[PDB]
A paper describes a structure:
E. coli aspartate aminotransferase (AAT) is a pyridoxal phosphate (PLP)-dependent enzyme that catalyses the reversible transamination of l-aspartate with α-ketoglutarate, yielding oxaloacetate and l-glutamate. During its catalytic cycle, AAT undergoes hinge movement to switch between an open conformation, in the ligand-free form, and a closed conformation upon association with substrates or inhibitors. Using our approach, we enrich the less populated but catalytically active closed conformation in order to increase catalytic efficiency (kcat/KM) with the non-native substrate l-phenylalanine, leading to altered substrate selectivity. Steady-state kinetics reveal kcat/KM increases of up to 100-fold towards this aromatic amino acid, resulting in a selectivity switch of up to 1900-fold, and structural analyses by room-temperature X-ray crystallography and multitemperature nuclear magnetic resonance (NMR) spectroscopy confirm that the conformational landscape is remodeled to favor the target state.
We crystallized WT, HEX, and select variants from the Closed (VFIT and VFIY), OpenLow (VFCS), and OpenHigh (AIFS) libraries. To obtain structures in the absence of maleate, we applied a rigorous crystal soaking method to serially dilute and extract the inhibitor from the crystallized enzymes. Superposition of bound and unbound structures for each variant confirmed that closed library mutants VFIT and VFIY remained in the closed conformation in the inhibitor-free form, similar to HEX, while OpenLow variant VFCS and OpenHigh variant AIFS adopted the open conformation, similar to WT. Overlay of AAT structures (Chain A) in the presence and absence of maleate show transition from open to closed states upon inhibitor binding for WT, VFCS, and AIFS, but not for HEX, VFIT, and VFIY, which already adopt the closed conformation in the absence of bound inhibitor. Interestingly, the amplitude of the open/closed conformational transition that occurs in open variants upon maleate binding correlated with their computed ΔE values (VFCS < WT < AIFS), suggesting that this metric can be used to fine-tune this enzyme conformational landscape. Furthermore, DynDom analyses of all variants confirmed that only WT, VFCS, and AIFS undergo hinge motion upon maleate binding, which rotates the moving domain relative to the fixed domain by 4.6, 2.6, and 5.9 degrees, respectively. OpenLow mutant VFCS showed 19F NMR spectra that were very similar to those of WT within the tested temperature range, consistent with its preference for the open conformation. OpenLow mutants had lower KM values and were more catalytically efficient than WT with both l-phenylalanine and l-aspartate, which could be due to the fact that these mutants have ΔE values similar to the WT but stabilize both the open and closed conformations by >10 kcal mol‒1.
Author numbering:
A (entry chain A), B (entry chain B): -2 to 396
Amino acid sequence: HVGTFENITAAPADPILGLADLFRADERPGKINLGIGVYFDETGKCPVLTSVKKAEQYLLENETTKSYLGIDGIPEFGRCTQELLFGKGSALINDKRARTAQTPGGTGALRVAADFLAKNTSVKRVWVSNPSWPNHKSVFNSAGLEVREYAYYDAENHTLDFDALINSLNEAQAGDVVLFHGCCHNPTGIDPTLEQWQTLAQLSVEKGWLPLFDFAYQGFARGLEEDAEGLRAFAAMHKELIVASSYSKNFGLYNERVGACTLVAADSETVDRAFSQMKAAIRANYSNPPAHGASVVATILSNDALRAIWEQELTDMRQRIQRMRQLFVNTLQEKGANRDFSFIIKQNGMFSFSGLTKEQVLRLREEFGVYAVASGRVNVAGMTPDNMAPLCEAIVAVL
Amino acid sequence: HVGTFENITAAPADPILGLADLFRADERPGKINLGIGVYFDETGKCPVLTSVKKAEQYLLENETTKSYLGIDGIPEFGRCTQELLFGKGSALINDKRARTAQTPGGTGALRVAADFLAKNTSVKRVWVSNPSWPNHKSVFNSAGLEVREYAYYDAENHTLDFDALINSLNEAQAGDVVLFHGCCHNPTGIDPTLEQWQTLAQLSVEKGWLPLFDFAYQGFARGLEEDAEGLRAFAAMHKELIVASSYSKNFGLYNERVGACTLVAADSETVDRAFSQMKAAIRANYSNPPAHGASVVATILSNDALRAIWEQELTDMRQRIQRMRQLFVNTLQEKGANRDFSFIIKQNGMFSFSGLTKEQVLRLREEFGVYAVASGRVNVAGMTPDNMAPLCEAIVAVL
Ligand SMILES: Cc1ncc(COP(=O)(O)O)c(C=O)c1O
Ligand SMILES: *Cc1c(COP(=O)(O)O)cnc(C)c1O
């Protein structure tokens, strides 16, 4: 009677999280963490938004029960989500072509979609960008879906390689899923222009793809409505699509696990039929979703006063990151870098590829106490006026 | 192109959660909800516990960040969970043989265990009592495991059929998983005696089963420690086991999704190796767990003054249910029932198997507005002094 657990092989280190335990252990003073994807403020802290604290006080005074939510969560949460993604007065909403389930984070939204697709459709293949968020492949593989990669980044020009993106998707067939980042591509910060989004929307229709949008950073590129232009171009042309969205970053609600999976089909009758199977996939996973984070979002979005506070806090975050992008480039020059880092200014969101090699990312860590993901992705929101000069001196030393 | 969603078949209703939907829509003022397993107080409400409101007020004023938890959640939540399960000073704890992940509810803990087994071991079959919670089968089937049923309930004598149980399980092979309810069996309310638990533990070892304990009602049968006696007899003999526990009910934190998956192995090296893969399965599901409800639990169990308040609140819930069981049986005789219902006094927890047929349950709903599960399972914790007479009048009218 051998043990069931004896033949188990240890799992490797998570590329984004295996770094953060290694940082908490580093006993050297002045270590700098440019790793995980949370926003920091000017003091190097990840604070709770004021609008979130106000909403939580209201919930504390007014909640009378913790009784289970429905499988698909708080109804007002789904309605507010659809307005954010598609626009108030969107035809998708008036025609009742969309259904939204509240999920545990954006990751939970991707997993719910994966399980739904694997069990209820003939989907076998998901196409994701090279590079992408590393957990994309793990989520879809957990449902038994093959993940293929399409070309995306021109590492010479630090730009979108649009010709190669098109050519690399030539073999994506009708009924394959193609995954797009809605804005603030993770990790490159390079997003399609509006004309490129429109080109992709037309191509997607002709080839019969099922688009799946991962929308974790709405509001961090240009603004809430501007950042959804690409999704709304797809939505104007497609009968069917899926949107996995996250409120982890734009509400600073990371650890409360607040996301949404939104299904769109040709008509009300079809999406309700499909959504009933998505609810069955949720029930066999975590049963029903956590209330606290989504109650906060629904409260803020339903209250004109709180929503005005939140939108300003989101603008404040967006502008800080842009300020840091400029300061990073200026300070690298001041500290003597001869490589041109000006592409950094053109990139959107929290993350840019620095262009550093795994070998330089390792030298920064072991020699200077500066922590970046081994792909060379650095979190610009982890940079402050206080840590920018040491950080830049370190990069310049390993160049 | 024909749509990917066009030919999806609609999912059937959940036998528990679909009932709740019907109950909401029912416009009759006298309707009575004996379906879903939530606790109601003497006034028919599902309250937030006082210990929980106090912990939530502490969190509101002292939380400074919502930054992601680690994949396995709050460390103190895991330590407190193991103490509750195995007891302060257990050798599993001092030998470092146990690892706990915070999960989204007991359901999420079940799905995480199932995914982990399916993807990292040779396990193929899970054995589940007949009857059991209806969602057990969906969770294990959705992870790719086969579900087999073992005998349990003697429907004529309203008792545990221990000879049938043991002969059923002689077909379970070594390396199969056998699922046990820790206490307050759902739906029958009939649990093994300590002497039967000890018989099963010895037998489990001889045959090479991997025990999986589902522990959603610790404290609702006799007490916190007494309700863990059967699990602790297993933990005394086995090299390996899995416990999926829930805080939904004994903390009234249903909609915050608070549970734990606890892995036990032969030694520290093996459990950490196994746990590394469990973390991978979580990362590919919901990434990391929701903080609010687990933080409430850990605040309460970590503070003797809050813990004392909570323990009294749990005792009060347990005693109120015991008072309704007696009131239920006495009132049925007063209302003209000629059958003996005294077996309800011998059942533990929220649920009693009433012995009503599907046709009688349907008639209770349609004609009297009394909602029970089609199996005839009734939630005693939904009974109150005020609704007892009409409820019993309805049941007598359909006998
Ligand atoms: C036996 C059993 N297992 C699991 C669960 C699920 O617990 P949770 O709501 O925390 O997911 C329940 C509660 O409904 C239960 O009765
Ligand atoms: C961070 C991130 C997620 C995960 O969002 P959570 O809400 O934390 O689960 C998903 N997709 C992308 C592209 C991300 O950057």
